[PDB]
Design a protein around this ligand. Structure first.
Ligand code: B12
Ligand SMILES: CC[C@H]1O[C@@H](n2cnc3c(N)ncnc32)[C@H](O)[C@@H]1O
Ligand SMILES: CC[C@H]1O[C@@H](n2cnc3c(N)ncnc32)[C@H](O)[C@@H]1O
Ligand SMILES: CC[C@H]1O[C@@H](n2cnc3c(N)ncnc32)[C@H](O)[C@@H]1O
Ligand SMILES: [N+]
Ligand SMILES: [N+]
Ligand SMILES: [N+]
Lengths: 252, 453, 453, 453
C-alpha cells in the first residue's frame, strides 16, 4: 500500500544503484523539486510518473474551486466583483477581470475612505487556496503594521475574479497613493498556496506600465512565510511614499 | 494588391494587410480574445488565399506598427538587405513558401534570402504552412551559434538546465543542477529564474552555478533570468557573467511594459564582450511567446503570431546565442488546448529558424490550461524532428516556483536516444569524461546526481 | 491481488481486473460510451496505480472474455510460452513497464519475454505509459517481416499505396498508383478497398495492380481488401496472389460480426503458400482499430484499448507481413479529437510491437470528428520516431471512396527525408533504378506520374 | 618588471618595453632603418630573454603608442575581455608561448585566452618563437569565416584571384579570371587593384567580375581594392557589392596617411549589411604588411613586427572575411632578402591567427629586392603547412600592373595536391560541376581557360 499524496511518497528515492545513497537523501530533502526519482532507461520510473499524474489531478481541481461567500464575511470585507460572472469566463477573459463591474464603482466610493495613503486590496485571482491558507497569517500584521507608526490606511475589500491591472482603477476611484494587491498565482503542480503582492505608487489607467509595479511573489509556507512577508510589504509601502516611485522607478 | 477573394462563389472582403494576417491563423483562443480571428472556417481559408497571393512587397510595406512610431519596426526595417529584398519583392507569399520547402533550396540560398525578409513576411509564410510544412521547413533551416558550447548543428540537441527555487535556496538550486547534468542537460545554459531581483541575490545564485562549473570544468554557461539592468550591474561588480538574458516583446510599447529600452540590449552586448566568460561570440539570451503583446495591450490590433515573429526580427539584430518561445507559459486565454499549443510551438520555431536565430522552445503548459504532460512529450518530439535547438529541463518538468510544467530531464535523454542526436560537441566530451554518456547514450550510472560526490 | 488504493486520503475501490483495465485508460469518448471510463482524473490515476501493482499472473488469469466462451481468448492463451510466462508471472505491471523501457533490455531479451505475455498484459503496460514511453518503448521493439520487400528494419520506413475509387475504375486506380510510385510509396503493399465484393471485380483490380508491377519489375505485392473468402476464391481461380487481407476483431463475437471464422485465416495461410507470388514467408495482412468490438456489441464490458490488444494477440498467431491500426477510421463516438486519436495511435503501435507483429498505422481522421489534416501530420511523425513500420498513401490523403482523410504521398517522402529514413531495401533499389530516389531523397524528376510513360 | 639580464657575464640593459620588443626581433633591414634593431646576436638574445620574462601585464600596460593619443590603441584596449586578461595578466611571455604551443591547449582554450591579449602581447609571443614554432602554433589556431564561401577550415586552402591590368581593361581582367578559375583559384575572392580611383571605373570592373559570377553561378565574391570611400559610393549607387576592402595601418597617424577614418570602416560594415551580395556574415577585407607604419613615419619608435600586430588588433574589431599580409610588396629597405621575407611571412600569419582573424598571406617579392620566384614557392608551402587561409593567384605570378611577383595559379593547385588540401567546400562543389576538379585534383581538362566557352 502507498498513498501517492503522502510524505513517504514525496521522499521516495528511485535511483537503482546509487554512487552515494546518503547524498541522495540529502539532495531530496534539500528541495521540493522531484529529484532522485531514478529512471527506466531514459524514461521516468512508474511511481514517479504516478505521483506526477496524481498531483496533477489535484492541481486541476484547485483551479476551478472558489472561495465561499461564508468565508469572506467571517473576515468582514466588502464583496465586490469585476465584470466577470463565473469562473469559466474568468479563465478566458483577462480584459474583463482588469475592470470593475457597474455596481462595483458604486460600492467603493460609498463604503471606503477617500484618498488613503496605503490601500490593501485582496483578490482570489487564479487560486483560492493561496488566499484562505495564508489569510489569517498575513493580513492581521499587515493592517497593524500600516497603523503602528504608519499613515492613512484605506478600507480593505475583496475583489472576486480579479487580475493585477485592476488595481489601477482602484487607485483612481479611491485616489490612493500606494495600492497593495494580494492575489493568488496560478496553481503549481505540487501546491496552490503561493500568493503574490503587486504594489504600485499612484496608478493611472492611461500611463501606468507593468514595469512601474513592484512584485513580492511566492508568499506561502514553502516560500516567503506570510508573517515575514507582511513585514516586508509594510517596509516596501514606506519606501514608495518617500521616493515617490514604484517598480523600476525606485532605487536601492 | 487584392484584399478580396471568391470562395465557392462567396466574396470575402478584408480591410487591410493586418486583418488578413490575423484571420489566416489557425484557430486559437488568443485571436478570439483579440477580436481579430476569422468568423468561419471559410473566411480563414479565404484569408489564407488572399495572403498567399500577396507579394513580399505588400507585407514589407504594411507592417502592423508604423515605422516612425515603433523602434522595433525601425530596427526590423533598417536591418533588411535591400539587394536581397529586390530579388524577392515581387514574389507571392505562395511562392516564398514553396521556395523555403524546396529541396533544391540550399541552406546558403536561404542564408541570403532571409536577409530580404521582415517579421511580417516571416509570419505570413507560417500562416499558410501545415504542421509538417513548419517541421520540414524549419529542419532545413539550421542556425548554429557558439558560446562555450556549439548549438544548432544538425544531428545535435541541447537543453537548458532550469534549477528554479521558491526561496532561491542555493542548496535546492545546486541539487537540481547535479540532477540535470546526470541526464546530460545543461549544454544550452544553466539558467535560474530568480525570486528576488537584487544584485546581491543574483551574485549568490551565479556563484552557486559557477562553483559547479569550475569544480568539474563543465563546458557551458550560467545565467540568471532577472532584469537585464540588474544582470549588467551584477556583472560589472564582479559576478561571473555567462549569458545575459532579457524578456522581449514585439513592440516599442511592449518593451516599455517590460521596462526595456533598445540601448539596454546594446549595453548588455558591450558588457558581455568585456566581462563574460564566453569562448564564442554569442552571449545573449531571449525568451518569447505568443500573447505577450496582447497582454501588454501593445499588439495594436495585430494577431499574436505576427507579434511573435516581430520578436525574432528584434532578436536577430543582437545575434544571441539562444532564443526560445515559452509556448504555453501564460494561460488558456491565448493558447487553449493541445492542438493550439503544438501548432504555436511549430509556428514559433519555424518563424525563429526562418528569421535566422538560434531558436529553441520551452515545451510547456499551465494547470488552468486544457493540457497535460503528454502534450509536452508530443511537442518536444515534433520539435526535435524540426531541428529545435534546445528545450528546457527540470526534475520531471515540475517548476516549483513558476507554477507550470515544462519538459523533464528524462525528456532530453529520451529525445537524444530516440532520434540518435548528440549534445553540444563540447558538452558531450565532458559527459563522456564524466562517465555519464557513451556513444550518445546514457551509461548505467547516468541519472544519478550522487555521482558528483 | 489488491483492487483498491488510497489517494489523497480517499479510498478508491474497484470491482475486478476488467474495471481496473478500463479506468486506467486515458480519457476517450469510447470508454465513456461503454460506461467503463473513470469518473475523474483522480480515479483514473488510482486505477493506474492498482493496475501497476497487479502482477502479470493477475492479468493473465483474468481475460476480459472467458476461455471456454471465446476462441480468440483460447488462441491467445494457447500460444503463450509457459516457460517465458513463469519467469515473469510474479512481475508487477510497474516492473514490466520499466523492463520494456530499460536500455539494459535488449531486443533479444524482449523477444523471449513477450512470448510469456497475453494481450491483456500488453494492454496493461500501455495503460501506465506516457506518450513518450509508448514512443521510445516501441522504438526499441522492432519487428521485421519479409514478403517481396523487407519491412520494419530500423532506419527504414515503408508505406502502403491505397488507390481507391468510387466505382473500382481501373483508370482511376492506375492513375493513383503511378502518382504514389513517383513519391516512393508502395513498398508495404499496393492495396485497394473494393467497392463491389465479387470475384470478377477483384481479378480485374489485381490484374491492373500486377500489370504495373510486371511492367516495371517492381519489388512489391498487390492486395484487394475485400472479404478473405472472396480473395481466396479469386486467387484459387487464377488471380495474382500477393498479400491476403482480412479485418479482425478482438472477440469471437466480433469475428462473427465480420463473418470471419478462424478456419478462414488458416485457409488464407494455406492458399498463400500454394498460389501467392511472394518470395519471403509472410503474406497476410490485417487491419485493426479501437472501437470495432464496441461497435459490434462484442466488447463484453471491456475497454477499447484492451480489446484492441486482443487483435494483436490474434494476428501474432498467423505471423502476417503487415498489421496496421486504422486509428481514426470510424468516428468521434470512439475517438473524439486530436488528443485522443494521437494517444490511441501511440498505444496501438506500442501494443502491436510488444505483441511481436509488423505494426503499422493508418494515421487518419473523419470529417464528422474534431480533427484536421494537421493531426495526421503530427501523429505520422511521432509514430515514425516510434519506428512505425508503415503508413498509408493517397493523393493529398483524400480518399474519394472511403470518405476519410489519411496521409499523403508527400507525407512518406517528408518523413523519410526529415528523419533520414530509407524505404524497404528492395524497393529502394527499384526507385534508384527509376531515377526517382537518390540517397533516400526524391530526385528532381520525382513526384511526376508521367515519368512512367 | 626587469629591463636587464646578464648574458655571458655581460650585463644587457634596455630603456623600456618598446626597446625590448624591437631588439628581440630577428634581424631585418626595417628595424635597422628605424634605428631600433639589436646591435648583435648577443643583444638580440638578451632582449628575447628579458621579453620572455616580462608578464602579459607588463606589455599590455605599455603600448607603443599611448591610449589618449591613438584611436587604434584605444580600439585594441577597449575590445580586451578583462576577465580573460585577469586570468593571464601575470603569465610571463615565456609561459604564454608554451601555452600556445601546448598540445594540451585546445582550440577552445585559445578562443577565450586570446580575448585577454593585446597586439603588443601577440607581437611579444612571436618574437620568442622559432620558425617551426610560428608554423605549428598557427596551425593549431584555425580561424573560420563565411561569405559566399567558407574559408579557414583545416584541410582546406583558398586563393584570391587577382586579375590586374595596366588600364583596367575588362578584356584583360576577364582573361585572367577564366585562367584562374581553370586552376581552382577564386574561392577567397576575385579582387582587382584598380588603376583609376573613380566610381564609374569601379562599377565597370565589378560588372565584369560579377558577369562571370552570374554566368556560371560561381559561389564566390568580387571586390575592387580602391579606397573604401569610393567603394562605398559605387555600391550605394548600385554596383554589385561583395567584399569591401581597405588597407590599414597600426597607428592613427598611419590611417590618416591612407586617408582612413574609423567611421569609414564602420560605414563599410553598415553598407555591406544593406547592399552586399553575401550569404554569410563576413564581408570585409583588409591587407597589411611590415613597413607600412615606418613608411608613413607613424611607427613612433616601434619595430615593424609590433606595429604589424596592431593591424590585426584593429582588423579583429570588424570581424572581416579575410585578411592577408603583403609580405614583400614594398621593398628591400624593410625586408631585404629571402631569409627576412620568409620569417616575416611566418610571424605575420602567426600573429594574425593568434589575434583571431582569417589570416592569409600574399607571398610576394619585388624586383629591387634580393629575391626570386623560388622564395615565393618556399614560403607558400611553409605557410600552407601553417594552415594559411589563402594566398594570391596570377598568371605565373606576374602582376603586369603592380610591378611585383606573387604566387601563380599553378601554385595553389600545387599546394592543394601536395598537401591533400581542398578548396572552400562551396567552391569545390562548383569546380566539380565544371569538370575542373575531381577529388581535390585538377582533371585533365583543367588549366584551360577555353573551357568556359
Ligand atoms: C506568467 C508570468 C509572466 C507573463 C505575464 C503574462 C500574463 N500573466 O498574462 C509575462 C510573459 C509577461 C512575464 C514576463 C515577466 N515576468 Co513574469 N511572471 C508570470 C508568473 C509565472 C505568473 C503571474 C501570475 O500568475 N499572476 C496571477 C494572475 C492572476 O495575475 P495576472 O493579472 O493574470 O498576471 C499579471 C501579472 O502577473 C503581471 N506580471 C507577470 N510577470 C511579472 C513580473 C513583474 C516584475 C511585474 C511587476 C508584473 C508581472 O503580468 C500579468 C498581466 O498584468 C509569475 C510567477 C509567479 N510565481 O507568480 C512571474 C513573475 C511575476 N514574473 C517575473 C519576471 C522576472 C518577469 C519579467 C520582469 C521578466 C523580465 N526580465 O523581463 C517580466 C515582467 C513583465 C512585466 N513587467 O509585466 C517574476 C517577478 C520577479 C520580481 N522580483 O518582481 C515572477 C514572480 C517570476 C520570477 N521569475 O520570479 N511574466
Ligand atoms: C516570469 C516569466 C518568465 O518566462 C518568460 N516568458 C514566458 N512567457 C513569455 C512570453 N510570452 N514572452 C516573453 N517571455 C516569456 C520570461 O522571459 C520570464 O523569464
Ligand atoms: C471498410 C473498412 C476498412 O477499414 C479497415 N478498418 C477500419 N477501422 C477498423 C477497425 N477498428 N478494426 C478493423 N478494421 C478496420 C477494415 O479492415 C476495412 O478494410
Ligand atoms: C596599392 C598597394 C596595395 O597593396 C596592399 N599592401 C601592400 N603592402 C601593404 C602594407 N604593408 N600594409 C597595408 N597594405 C599593403 C594595399 O592594401 C594596396 O591594396
Ligand atoms: N509575442
Ligand atoms: N479493436
Ligand atoms: N604594418
Amino acid at each position: 500500500a502507498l498513498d501517492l499524496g503522502s510524505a513517504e511518497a514525496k521522499a521516495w528515492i528511485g535511483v537503482e544503484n546509487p554512487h552515494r545513497a546518503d547524498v541522495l537523501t540529502e539532495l531530496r530533502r534539500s528541495t521540493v523539486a522531484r529529484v532522485c526519482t531514478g529512471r527506466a532507461g531514459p524514461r521516468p520510473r512508474t511511481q514517479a510518473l504516478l505521483r506526477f499524474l496524481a498531483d496533477h489531478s489535484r492541481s486541476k481541481d484547485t483551479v476551478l474551486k472558489e472561495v465561499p461567500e461564508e468565508w469572506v464575511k467571517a473576515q468582514g470585507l466588502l464583496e465586490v466583483r469585476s465584470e466577470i460572472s463565473d469562473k469559466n469566463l474568468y479563465l478566458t477573459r483577462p480584459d474583463m477581470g482588469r475592470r470593475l463591474c457597474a455596481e462595483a464603482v458604486e460600492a467603493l466610493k460609498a463604503q471606503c475612505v477617500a484618498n488613503p495613503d496605503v490601500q490593501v486590496v485582496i483578490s482570489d485571482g487564479l487560486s483560492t487556496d493561496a488566499i484562505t491558507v495564508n489569510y489569517e497569517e498575513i493580513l492581521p500584521p499587515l493592517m497593524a503594521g500600516l497603523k503602528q507608526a504608519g499613515l492613512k490606511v484605506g478600507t480593505p475589500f475583496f475583489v472576486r475574479y480579479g487580475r493585477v491591472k485592476i488595481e489601477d482603477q482602484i487607485g483612481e476611484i479611491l485616489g490612493a497613493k500606494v495600492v497593495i494587491l494580494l492575489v493568488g498565482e496560478r496553481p503549481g503542480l505540487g501546491q496552490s498556496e503561493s500568493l503574490s503582492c503587486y504594489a504600485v505608487y499612484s496608478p493611472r489607467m492611461a500611463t501606468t506600465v507593468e514595469a512601474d509595479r513592484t512584485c513580492i511573489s511566492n508568499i506561502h509556507q514553502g516560500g516567503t512565510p506570510p508573517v515575514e512577508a507582511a513585514a516586508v510589504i509594510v517596509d516596501l509601502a514606506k519606501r514608495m511614499l518617500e521616493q515617490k516611485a514604484s517598480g523600476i522607478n525606485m532605487t536601492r | 494588391m487584392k484584399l478580396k477573394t471568391t470562395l465557392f462563389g462567396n466574396v470575402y472582403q478584408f480591410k487591410d494587410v493586418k486583418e488578413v494576417l490575423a484571420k489566416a491563423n489557425e484557430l486559437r483562443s488568443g485571436d478570439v480574445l483579440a477580436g481579430v480571428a476569422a468568423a468561419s472556417s471559410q473566411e480563414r481559408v479565404a484569408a489564407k488565399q488572399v495572403l498567399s497571393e500577396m507579394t513580399v512587397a505588400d507585407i514589407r510595406n504594411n507592417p502592423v506598427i508604423a515605422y516612425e512610431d515603433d523602434c522595433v519596426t525601425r530596427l526590423i526595417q533598417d536591418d533588411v538587405n535591400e539587394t536581397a529584398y529586390n530579388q524577392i519583392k515581387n514574389w507571392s507569399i505562395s511562392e516564398l513558401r514553396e521556395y523555403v520547402l524546396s529541396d533544391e533550396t540550399s541552406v546558403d540560398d536561404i542564408a541570403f534570402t532571409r536577409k530580404g525578409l521582415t517579421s511580417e513576411v516571416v509570419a505570413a509564410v507560417a500562416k499558410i504552412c501545415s504542421n509538417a510544412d513548419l517541421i520540414y521547413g524549419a529542419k532545413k533551416m539550421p542556425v548554429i551559434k557558439k558560446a562555450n558550447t556549439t548549438i544548432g548543428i544538425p544531428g545535435t540537441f541541447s537543453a537548458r538546465l532550469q534549477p528554479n527555487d521558491t526561496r532561491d535556496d542555493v542548496q535546492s538550486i545546486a541539487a537540481q543542477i547535479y540532477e540535470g547534468l546526470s541526464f546530460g542537460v545543461g549544454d544550452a545554459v544553466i539558467g535560474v529564474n530568480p525570486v528576488t531581483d537584487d544584485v546581491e541575490n543574483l551574485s549568490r545564485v551565479l556563484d552557486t552555478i559557477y562553483g559547479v562549473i569550475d569544480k568539474f570544468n563543465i563546458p557551458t554557461q550560467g545565467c540568471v533570468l532577472a532584469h537585464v539592468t540588474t544582470q549588467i550591474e551584477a556583472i560589472r561588480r564582479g559576478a561571473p557573467g555567462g549569458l545575459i538574458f532579457q524578456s522581449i516583446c514585439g513592440s516599442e510599447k511592449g518593451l516599455k511594459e517590460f521596462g526595456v529600452e533598445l540601448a539596454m540590449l546594446d549595453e548588455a552586448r558591450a558588457v558581455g564582450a568585456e566581462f563574460n566568460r564566453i569562448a564564442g561570440e554569442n552571449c545573449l539570451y531571449f525568451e518569447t511567446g505568443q500573447g505577450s503583446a496582447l497582454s501588454a495591450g501593445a499588439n495594436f490590433g495585430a494577431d499574436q503570431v505576427t507579434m511573435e515573429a516581430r520578436n525574432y526580427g528584434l532578436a536577430r539584430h543582437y545575434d544571441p546565442f539562444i532564443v526560445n518561445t515559452v509556448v504555453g507559459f501564460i494561460g488558456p486565454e491565448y493558447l487553449y488546448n493541445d492542438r493550439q499549443i503544438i501548432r504555436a510551438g511549430l509556428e514559433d520555431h519555424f518563424m525563429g529558424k526562418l528569421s535566422g536565430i538560434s531558436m529553441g522552445c520551452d515545451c510547456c503548459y499551465t494547470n488552468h490550461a486544457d493540457a497535460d504532460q503528454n502534450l509536452n512529450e508530443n511537442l518536444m518530439i515534433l520539435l526535435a524532428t524540426a531541428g529545435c535547438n534546445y528545450i528546457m529541463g527540470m526534475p520531471l518538468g515540475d517548476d516549483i516556483m513558476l507554477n507550470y510544467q515544462t519538459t523533464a530531464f528524462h525528456d532530453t535523454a529520451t529525445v537524444r536516444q530516440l532520434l540518435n542526436l548528440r549534445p553540444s560537441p563540447e558538452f558531450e566530451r565532458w559527459l563522456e569524461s564524466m562517465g555519464i554518456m557513451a556513444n550518445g547514450r546514457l551509461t548505467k550510472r547516468a541519472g544519478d546526481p550522487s555521482l558528483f560526490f
